[PDB]
Design a protein around this ligand. Structure first.
Ligand SMILES: Cc1ncc(C[n+]2csc(CCOP(=O)(O)OP(=O)(O)O)c2C)c(N)n1
Ligand SMILES: Cc1ncc(C[n+]2csc(CCOP(=O)(O)OP(=O)(O)O)c2C)c(N)n1
Ligand SMILES: CC(C)CCC(=O)O
Ligand SMILES: [Mg+2]
Ligand SMILES: [Mg+2]
Lengths: 361, 323, 362, 323
């Protein structure tokens, strides 16, 4: 019914051998459990497809999300897509995918083609969708926390019954705006859920040098809101705790801070060298905690998984990826004139002049 | 009805809030207290805590939440207690608010207003605010307005609240109650982006706005005593500014002096001056002269000297005339 | 000895009848105890003097510190003035007085005369002293927290053995820089002590609308440092808890967040109106909690206080105040030229031209 | 020895750190990582963690702590990973750092350096391309330096570290390894506040700095083949800028073009341009022309159309010459 706050050990629901560890009985249909797995696989494969986009030069930058799948897919399923709002950051393409954002739009933004509803205005890993309330990613770390708080306050005043989820890494919790935004949301009892995808690294800076609080969940005490420590490699534990936080917010009980402990298997980004500041013992250790194989065992133990289904799912996903990429590419390059559009609702005199000057070029 | 700027601003908010339930006011001490300058007096009492809300002491939270509210469904009018204090929430303003429409390809908009008192020029026991408009003008995506009359205060604030683009609204504290003016109670707005001709002249163009208005007007009067007709042009909107109005005046007079209390270097008047030189070189009979705040932090003791004086403005006018 | 952290009830040491509540023996000599009392009187009297400076138009702005005496005097005595650093805010003139800053300089800053070592650059309530490591007050709320952290880190790297105390109000705890600065200090285990003078108000915004955490001390959890809830109207509790945190810092154990619960008897400032958002009941109720009378009874119960001594102290104090004001005034107005001094070590070309342009007017 | 700008900068830091124990480096990923651009590579292993320290992800903590350290006894060189990310720490930079000496009547000083990669032409989008120098130049109390060669990189950074005044040091990232120029291994410094003459000419003056030097120098070269002798001036220091160097050149040539990738409105080149028009109108044979970045957030897709092209510069030069 209600998870424990500030727990000593991270909350986990999936046993080492695929057994259910929850006090309450599992209440998700087999179809839904398979959906969760499907989405994680799609997320992992999207990530690997991104790697290829780098190698072929189709995209100039990527932020490997491998290892974040359980957390990202769980979040996507704890809210109501198209109704609730999501304020993500650059590494959430897995969450974006499971939320329902068309591959066409994601790959379109990665490649900066007309398929990008964001019109190729930003560098890769900056998705955004009006239709799915996926607040367009901004580069400055934690800068989207105050806005998330605001949207939540808006939902409360307008009594829309919506919820706003805000995701960010461990490093983000050190920014002043992170604290300021949440503090305000907490004071207003706003329906917002702040979720940390803690991978113990902010590029090369480790958690030990990031903050002195033993956990991120503890930071919740600074706002007087509940904080949860969760195994982010456990898709069920992540879904249920975030789900509970979301329901709490939706019923007007205020925000919560959920810490999903995960691990970044790839380098910080395509412009980094992971195996240049991390102990192989640590990486190896965590590679055995991969959320996908872990949930696979849980499904297998219940007759919800088999090798043949694995193959079909992977092949369906691969086909979709190709279709999506093809559509994004065929959309064509964004027009040069678009550079002067959307700065304001309409172009003022100086932009018209600047555009005109450029056109003469 | 005659009223001070405070009264006009207050009436503008009251009016807009009565017209649209989505218009909300948020900031430090804006509710119960009615604001440190009383601009929001009585609003909480009339519209309630869900329409007028005191916020925690964080400019990042104020600017940022306003952006979130605007993107979602409200028409927030945020207040930064003093222009100087916008900095703690500077990133929210320039990275989130200013670029929302652009970075989202138009999917998300920021129909919000951020008002704030600015400038010094008065010792009423309140903080002297160094005008930071240049920071805003330099940032693409923000509309910037600075008013100097009760009539303009009401007309433009209402215009900003209806404008879908983010608007930074500067209110010169020295002008909050410095003079009453006839302000229609009927609904009316003024156009953002258009300058106001305060006085027509043919020998000298005095480009100005906000805080320095008083000294600039008196300087024109002094000049009149000497047979010199100065055209005083209050830009009002710093972004996008009235290019036409400026150039038409300079073209006529052939000589111009730009005045502001903002620091000189990379200031907004520097922009206008550089643009006049780049486009109307052939129409200049004298160099565009800039009378601005000095390139030092705002001095409390020498406030009288930092804020451009009538004398400082006249010395520049003379230099432009004798050239 | 170690005080309890995150206590539900604020830590107290002075009983209502002058009884010692500590779970350790009182170790302050009789003289030192009387000094704490003396300084609180001085702080209070300076504050009332400020009220007159406003009424008489001598200064344009004051931030009444009446009610913060126990907290401010305690902090001043928990450290080693001239050695340790202080990163204060505008309402700490009581702390500045007790720390040993010359009245001539405090009042000089209030009157903006040449007596102000800060050269009348800022408005009143912005004292600053190099001699006493009193980091000059800055206007933007909590902007001094990160610097305090840097100073502390410097003290650690340079092995000076100094500590940096940083004071601020409840409202300041809502700023991002407040959090960002302390977080860095905690991660580095820097010898810094963050002290909140919680008067439950940020001008007119009450605690309830300021933050949702039940106390400011609870915020320490976000940094993994100890947090203390203290009765800021109890000078002994304030002195000892802060002192302990200072010692913890001095011995390299990292920072602490100490919340001193006090009350602002006067309005936020001379530009505000207290009786416009506060019930006379609340104010009167905390009036009975004045830290001065409370500590008086404690000394009285030990034969360490008497009417005669009080009058003697008060008279010596009011004389010092009049002398300080006199010296501050006879200092003379700050020169207009100083307007261009100290922007940089030396005045660059553009400031020279600008300073020359001003002379065409003077 | 021949080295890239990164090598020169690293050399400078190493030299000053070996020279003075008080010199410390702090910022995100500056230690074990050696910096996201390798500028601090090896310093940690050589000087220890207490002199090269990784910081939490907070620009306010970085700048502010650097301020506190400088005021107490250290000589910190703070790094802001990308100039675009200076904003979260903006208040610390403009309120604490810039005004410390001033507001304390000289009692406290800020001998600190704030390094940051900047400029476009690297497909950085909105927050990996900005050139925010204007924000700094407009703030009294800060010295601003933008280098464009490995030689200047070492000389000016060393200078900055020795200067007791706060210095914001900008490093155009596209130039981090653009070329391997000759850089003396011996100890030398360069004067802050002095422009560097790249090309002597008499038909046109090209004022620029940082990011755009490649296209500008190339524009000069192409003007030569066409018979036009253009003088190229790299300001190097934006605040205080070399007033004499600029006026002398313009006095001679009579026509000037200012180039920068920073947004146009209220930019730094706008300041110099406005100042040229104000003090040398009589020496101008053509309007001061500004080739700047457009007044829009830095676009990803149109990256190459945003950054000033050699063509764009030549067109401006042509208008100046054909005037
Ligand atoms: C304000 C700001 N400073 C610095 C950067 C550069 N930067 C980009 S990603 C990153 C790491 C953030 O780490 P974390 O929040 O843990 O997220 P992760 O990448 O590990 O998922 C940094 C420092 C930035 N984008 N914004
Ligand atoms: C960044 C910033 N925002 C707003 C202000 C205006 N302001 C001055 S004092 C104050 C109240 C601060 O209250 P608190 O920190 O509780 O201290 P107190 O005055 O109650 O002791 C405010 C909002 C400011 N100085 N700086
Ligand atoms: C004097 C300041 C520190 C407080 C009042 C203000 O900020 O206006
Ligand atoms: Mg991380
Ligand atoms: Mg308070």
């Amino acid at each position: 019914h209600r998870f424990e706050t500030f727990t000593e050990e991270p909350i986990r629901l999936i046993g080492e051998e695929g057994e259910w560890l929850g006090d309450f009985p599992l209440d998700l249909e087999g179809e839904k459990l398979r959906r969760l797995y499907r989405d994680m696989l799609a997320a992992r494969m999207l990530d690997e497809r991104y790697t290829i986009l780098i190698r072929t030069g189709k995209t100039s930058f990527i932020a490997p999300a491998a290892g974040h799948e359980a957390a990202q897919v769980a979040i996507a399923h704890a809210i109501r897509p198209g109704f609730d709002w999501v304020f993500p950051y650059y590494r959430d393409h897995g969450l974006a995918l499971a939320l329902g954002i068309p591959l066409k739009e994601l790959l379109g933004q990665m490649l900066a083609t007309k398929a990008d509803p964001n019109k190729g205005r930003q560098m890769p890993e900056h998705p955004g969708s009006k239709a799915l309330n996926f607040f367009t990613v901004a580069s400055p770390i934690a800068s989207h926390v105050p806005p998330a708080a605001g949207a939540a306050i808006s939902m409360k005043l307008l009594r829309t019954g919506q919820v706003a989820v805000c995701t960010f890494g461990d490093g983000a919790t050190s920014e002043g705006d992170w604290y300021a935004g949440i503090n305000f949301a907490a004071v207003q009892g706003a329906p917002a859920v702040f979720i940390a995808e803690n991978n113990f690294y902010a590029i090369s800076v480790d958690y030990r040098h990031q903050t002195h609080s033993p956990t991120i969940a503890d930071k919740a005490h600074a706002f007087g809101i509940p904080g949860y420590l969760v195994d982010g490699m456990d898709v069920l534990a992540s879904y249920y705790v975030v789900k509970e936080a979301v329901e709490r917010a939706r019923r007007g009980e205020g925000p919560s801070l959920v810490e999903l402990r995960v691990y970044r298997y790839g380098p910080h980004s395509s412009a980094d060298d992971d195996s240049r500041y991390r102990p192989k013992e640590e990486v190896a250790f965590w590679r055995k905690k991969d959320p996908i194989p872990r949930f696979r065992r849980f499904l297998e133990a219940r007759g919800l998984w088999n090798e043949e289904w694995e193959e079909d799912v992977r092949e369906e996903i691969r086909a979709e990826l190709e279709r999506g990429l093809k559509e994004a590419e065929e959309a064509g390059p964004v027009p040069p004139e678009w550079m002067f559009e959307d700065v304001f609702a309409e172009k003022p005199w100086h932009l018209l002049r600047q555009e005109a000057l450029l056109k003469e070029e | 009805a005659l009223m001070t700027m405070v009264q006009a601003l207050n009436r503008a908010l009251d009016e807009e809030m009565a017209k649209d339930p989505r218009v909300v006011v948020l900031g430090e001490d804006v509710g119960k207290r009615g604001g440190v300058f009383l601009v929001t007096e009585g609003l909480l009492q009339k519209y309630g805590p869900d329409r007028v809300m005191d916020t925690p002491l964080s400019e990042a939270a104020i600017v940022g939440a306003a952006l979130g509210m605007a993107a979602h469904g409200l028409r927030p009018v945020a207040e930064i207690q003093f222009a100087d204090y916008i900095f703690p929430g500077f990133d929210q303003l320039v990275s989130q608010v200013a670029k929302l429409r652009y970075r989202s390809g138009g999917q998300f908009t920021a129909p919000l207003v951020v008002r704030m008192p600015s400038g010094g020029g008065v010792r009423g026991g309140h903080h002297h605010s160094q005008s930071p408009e240049a920071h805003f003008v330099h940032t693409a995506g923000l509309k910037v307005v600075a008013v100097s009359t009760p009539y303009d205060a009401k007309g433009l604030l209402k215009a900003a609240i209806r404008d879908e683009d983010p608007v930074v609204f500067l209110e010169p504290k020295r002008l909050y109650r410095s003079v009453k003016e006839e302000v229609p109670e009927e609904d009316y707005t003024l156009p953002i982006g258009k300058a106001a001709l305060r006085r027509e002249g043919k020998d000298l163009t005095l480009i100005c706005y906000g805080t320095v208005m008083p000294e600039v007007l008196q300087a024109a009067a002094e000049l009149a005593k000497a047979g010199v007709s100065a055209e005083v042009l209050d830009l009002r909107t710093l972004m996008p500014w009235d290019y036409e109005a400026v150039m038409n005046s300079v073209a006529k007079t052939g000589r111009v002096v730009l005045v502001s209390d903002a620091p000189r270097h990379a200031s907004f008047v520097s922009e206008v001056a550089a643009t006049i030189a780049e486009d109307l070189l052939d129409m200049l009979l004298a160099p565009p002269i800039r009378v601005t705040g000095f390139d030092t932090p705002y001095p409390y003791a020498q406030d009288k000297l930092y804020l451009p004086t009538v004398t400082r403005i006249l010395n520049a006018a003379k230099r432009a005339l004798d050239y």
